[PDB]
Ligand binder design. Structure first.
Ligand SMILES: NC(=O)C1=CN([C@@H]2O[C@H](COP(=O)(O)OP(=O)(O)OC[C@H]3O[C@@H](n4cnc5c(N)ncnc54)[C@H](O)[C@@H]3O)[C@@H](O)[C@H]2O)C=CC1
Ligand SMILES: Cc1cc2nc3c(=O)[nH]c(=O)nc-3n(C[C@H](O)[C@H](O)[C@H](O)COP(=O)(O)O)c2cc1C
Ligand code: SF4
Ligand code: FES
Lengths: 213, 430, 85
């Protein structure tokens, strides 16, 4: 929650962090996208790579990204403290993000947040003591017709009841992987009472093309 | 044409919007995409700019700037710097979930849009700044871009036209302000998402200091359909200077919250009752509608009966179109809790660069958190109004404007509900 | 920059010593607080010649106009790119 750093024993510039060699090939692939002379523009993917290797960012990944891109370390500190994904504290393995903005609060995502809080025994921001589940509360995640929805580390879980998210937490505790989709009768975003549109077959190539083309 | 709405399935631009067909290359070429692309590329930038200008296409990002007139700023000779079409794919606007559908379900339409747009403005590559929350959609789009390179459609000698054009995907990192075009440029450059000042516009100094056009996913993806089908075809739908089709995201308190492509000047009541089945409890249960996502001011039930969902008829309703995201709020809704949560969104998602947003959006969230309880006196309504007028137009980007607008809409349309809230607080705590 | 508008005439600063009773700044110079204001330089020169005061004149140091460009902070090939904003 804080935007200063204090050198704890488990988080310091002497904390061990280095990329794997396949991650060095990935950082080569990232840096080769950007033009020559603007290598610094590879801060945000590579640092996110340094979050996908470790799960979180101690202050050695910030120093390592500043070391391999030859940028000042303060310019990576700004990126890690500006963006809400760079977890600068050690999160659980299933980082649960509940969206409770206005289109999801209208569709009662507060009941889902209460269900996750009583199911895991924790509250918003805390971590379960087995370090599996981190429950926080985030802003609009972009699935507003599929509201109310949560996010688990890569995945969207949409149209949720409290029973649905209890089912998802149950199949996450046993080690299984769930299906990232809407848990109601619809598939992605269509009207739940059947398709009100795009029922006709798409015509294909050549349809309606103007002359002289 | 006088009436609008009830759009046919054959006049849709975004077929396979619902994921029912194959999103891949064999699916996209079976739906008309990547057809006669080389003949579009060979006919020059000026022909494509004339097709987009004649079509009446406006900004689908939310401001509604004329898209052909926007892209024609880049049709200017080189100076040693390359040019870049950069696709704004962030979509952090609450209520808005349409570009997620375009990237996840129609990716090759977006890739051909990047190609035709980058030919139209002489751009060298394409940076699709996709949202960091849209990870599976980003890998989805990267598989489609792999299918576009490996078929020889883009890259070296794109579609066999002698034109070279790359397409990149840069993921975000969870920042709503990085949807604004200059802050998106600042996020691609490896910096904080702090918006630049205008001028320099991105057509002069954009990404890496190059000429740049930052354009929405929708207004990029529909442009090969405009070039194939014609300009007059896309101009025939909707009113004049409100031409075309539009994706609408009906969410909130409706029976069937859904994304649907619909004609531009459709009535709001017809849209909600047809595609969403109406408001939960009927149309008489409607209390308010935020018409186009959080940035636009809400309109009450007395305006939603006859209003049209294009730019100009909503500007006549002293709100905006924006992202065309219809948030429906019925009678069971504490509207003050919802708008104070919306201002809480605009202070948790605000980059802190300049003064009036950084201070006043937190201060409007504190005043709105007291207005939820009613822990104020009614002279703090008009006071708060002045605070909105001290933010609207005095900031760098339009997130200060997009945070001043809902406060103004809530005050203007439900001042007596706030007043009776505060007076019942004042009597029950004294 | 409103304090850099009008010309001023001061004098040399003579001795300030410690008052033994209170530690205050005792002085013997009567002209130690005399700062005169003149709208132009030559009025001050004519005033100093008029009273017999030997005078030295510093010239008006004006700041030269700078080339301010907001786009220069985001150049392509130049070093004047800002590292952050
Ligand atoms: N789609 C979304 O997810 C969201 C959309 N919005 C909407 O975005 C809008 C605010 O966007 P802004 O960029 O701040 O407004 P708008 O004034 O700036 O900009 C739209 C386009 O017009 C161009 N433009 C305007 N005047 C120009 C000129 N004289 N010379 C050159 N180019 C010019 C700009 O380059 C820009 O690309 C609002 O309508 C808001 O509702 C807001 C939040 C989220
Ligand atoms: C705070 C803020 C956030 C924005 N977010 C987005 C966005 O996420 N996606 C988008 O297409 N436009 C967004 N815009 C609008 C852009 O400024 C710009 O109008 C658009 O990205 C490109 O213009 P276009 O309509 O011609 O495509 C945002 C504007 C502001 C002020
Ligand atoms: S007004 Fe707010 S959103 Fe805009 S540049 Fe300033 S801090 Fe950023
Ligand atoms: S509001 Fe929850 S996803 Fe947009």
């Amino acid at each position: 929650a804080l935007f200063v750093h204090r050198d704890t024993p488990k988080n310091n510039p002497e904390t061990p962090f280095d990329f794997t060699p396949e991650n060095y090939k990935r950082i080569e692939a990232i840096v080769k996208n950007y033009p020559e002379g603007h290598k610094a523009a590879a801060v945000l993917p590579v640092l996110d790579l340094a979050q996908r290797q470790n799960g979180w960012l101690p202050i050695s990944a910030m120093n390592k990204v500043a070391e391999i891109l030859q940028v000042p370390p303060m310019r990576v500190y700004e990126v890690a403290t500006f963006y809400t994904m760079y977890n600068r504290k050690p999160v659980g393995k299933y980082h649960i993000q509940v969206c409770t903005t206005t289109p999801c609060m209208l569709r009662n995502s507060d009941s889902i947040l209460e269900a996750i809080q009583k199911k895991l025994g924790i509250k918003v921001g805390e971590t379960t003591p087995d370090k599996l589940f981190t429950l926080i509360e985030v802003e609009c995640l972009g699935a507003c017709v599929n509201a109310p929805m949560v996010q688990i580390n890569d995945n969207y879980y949409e149209d949720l009841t409290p029973k649905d998210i209890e089912e998802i937490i149950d199949e996450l505790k046993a080690g299984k992987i769930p299906k990232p989709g809407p848990r109601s009768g619809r598939f992605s975003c269509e009207p739940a009472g059947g398709l009100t549109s795009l029922t006709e077959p798409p015509k294909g190539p050549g349809f309606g093309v103007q002359a002289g083309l | 044409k006088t009436s609008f709405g009830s759009l046919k399935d054959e006049d849709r631009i975004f077929t396979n919007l619902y994921g029912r067909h194959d999103w891949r290359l064999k699916g996209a070429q079976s739906r008309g995409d990547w057809y006669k692309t080389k003949e579009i590329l060979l006919k020059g930038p000026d022909w494509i700019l004339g097709e987009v200008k004649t079509s009446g296409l406006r900004g689908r990002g939310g401001a509604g700037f004329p898209t052909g007139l926007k892209w024609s700023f880049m049709n200017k000779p080189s100076d040693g710097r390359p040019k870049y079409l950069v696709v704004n794919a962030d979509e952090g606007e609450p209520g808005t979930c349409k570009d997620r559908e375009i990237i996840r379900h129609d990716p090759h339409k977006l890739v051909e849009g990047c190609l035709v747009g980058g030919r139209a403005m002489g751009a060298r590559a394409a940076y699709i700044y996709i949202r960091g929350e849209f990870y599976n959609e980003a890998s989805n789009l990267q598989v489609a871009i792999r299918e576009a390179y490996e078929a020889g459609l883009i890259g070296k000698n794109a579609c066999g036209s002698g034109y070279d054009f790359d397409v990149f995907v840069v993921r975000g990192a969870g920042a709503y302000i990085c949807g604004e075009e200059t802050a998106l440029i600042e996020s691609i450059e490896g910096k904080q998402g702090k918006p630049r000042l205008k001028p320099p516009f991105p057509a002069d100094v954009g990404v890496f200091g190059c000429p740049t056009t930052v354009a929405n996913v929708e207004t990029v993806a529909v442009s090969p359909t405009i070039c194939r089908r014609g300009g007059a075809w896309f101009a025939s739908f909707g009113r004049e200077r409100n031409s075309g089709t539009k994706l609408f995201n009906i969410s909130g308190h409706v029976n069937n919250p859904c994304t649907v492509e619909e004609e531009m000047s459709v009535p709001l009541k017809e849209l909600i009752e047809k595609h969403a089945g109406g408001v939960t409890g009927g149309w008489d249960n409607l209390l308010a509608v935020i018409p186009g996502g959080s940035s636009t001011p809400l309109i009450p039930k007395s305006v939603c009966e006859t209003v049209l969902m294009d730019f100009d008829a909503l500007i006549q309703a002293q709100t905006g179109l924006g992202t065309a995201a219809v948030i429906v709020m019925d009678r069971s809704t504490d509207i003050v809790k919802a708008i104070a949560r919306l201002i809480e969104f605009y202070k948790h998602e605000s980059c802190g660069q300049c003064t009036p947003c950084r201070e006043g959006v937190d201060w409007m969230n504190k005043v709105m958190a007291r207005f939820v309880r009613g822990d104020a006196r009614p002279a703090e309504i008009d006071s708060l109004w002045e605070i909105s007028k001290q933010i609207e137009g005095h900031t760098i980007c339009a997130l200060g404007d997009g945070a001043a607008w809902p406060v103004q809409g809530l005050i203007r349309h439900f001042r007596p509900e706030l007043e009776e809230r505060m007076q019942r607080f004042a009597q029950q705590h004294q | 920059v409103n304090n850099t508008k009008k010309w001023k005439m001061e004098f040399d600063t003579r001795e300030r010593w410690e008052n033994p009773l209170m530690g205050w700044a005792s002085t013997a110079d009567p002209l130690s607080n005399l700062v005169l204001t003149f709208s132009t330089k030559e009025d001050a020169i004519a005033f100093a010649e008029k009273n017999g005061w030997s005078y030295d004149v510093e010239e008006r140091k004006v700041p030269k106009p700078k080339s301010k460009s907001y786009g220069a902070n985001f150049s392509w090939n130049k070093r004047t790119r800002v590292s952050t904003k």
